[PDB]
Design a protein around this ligand. Structure first.
Ligand SMILES: [Zn+2]
Ligand SMILES: [Zn+2]
Ligand SMILES: [Zn+2]
Ligand SMILES: [Zn+2]
Lengths: 72, 73
DNA sequence: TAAAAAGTACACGTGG
DNA sequence: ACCACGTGTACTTTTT
C-alpha cells in the first residue's frame, strides 16, 4: 500500500487519504500554521519519497488535491 | 553598489573556490563536493536559485555552482 | 598590522 | 515529545 501523496509506504487513512506518516504530519503542520511556501519551478514538482522534501509548496498542494482535510 | 553571488544573487562576501559567491554558497559547495549526496531535482533541472529559493533544490544549486566554475583547487 | 580566502564550529529550522 | 540532517552565520587560521 502506497501514500497517494509521495508513493512511500502508506501508514493509514489519515485526514481522509491513504498517506504515509511523514505526509500525515506534514499536512497537519502545513494547515495549522503560518506557512508561506514558494515553488522554485512551475508549481508542478514531482513528489516522491526523496523529492517531497524539495518543494513543500507542491507537496501541500498535492495533499489538498488528494483531498486531505483536518475535518472528517 | 554591492557585489552579487554568481550562483544565487545574494550579496557576495568574496571570491570562493574560484568564483564570486555569498558565504552560504561557499560552504554549500564545499559540502557538496566532499560529501556524497543524492541530489535530485523535482522540477526540470532549471529551478530558480535565489536567496529565497536556494534551499529548495540542492541539485540545481550545485549544478549552477559547477557551471559557474567553482572548483576545490 | 591587514585584507582575502580557506578552514572550522555553533545555532537554527524542517522533517520523519 | 525527540534526534538527524541541511543550512547559514560567525569565528579562527592560513595566506598574501
Ligand atoms: Zn507520503
Ligand atoms: Zn514545486
Ligand atoms: Zn549564493
Ligand atoms: Zn531543480
Amino acid at each position: 500500500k502506497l501514500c497517494l501523496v509521495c508513493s512511500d509506504e502508506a501508514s493509514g487513512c489519515h485526514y481522509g487519504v491513504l498517506t504515509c506518516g511523514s505526509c500525515k504530519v506534514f499536512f497537519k503542520r502545513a494547515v495549522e500554521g503560518q506557512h508561506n511556501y514558494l515553488c522554485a519551478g512551475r508549481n508542478d514538482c514531482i513528489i516522491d519519497k526523496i523529492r517531497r522534501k524539495n518543494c513543500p509548496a507542491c507537496r501541500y498542494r498535492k495533499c489538498l488535491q488528494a483531498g486531505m482535510n483536518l475535518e472528517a
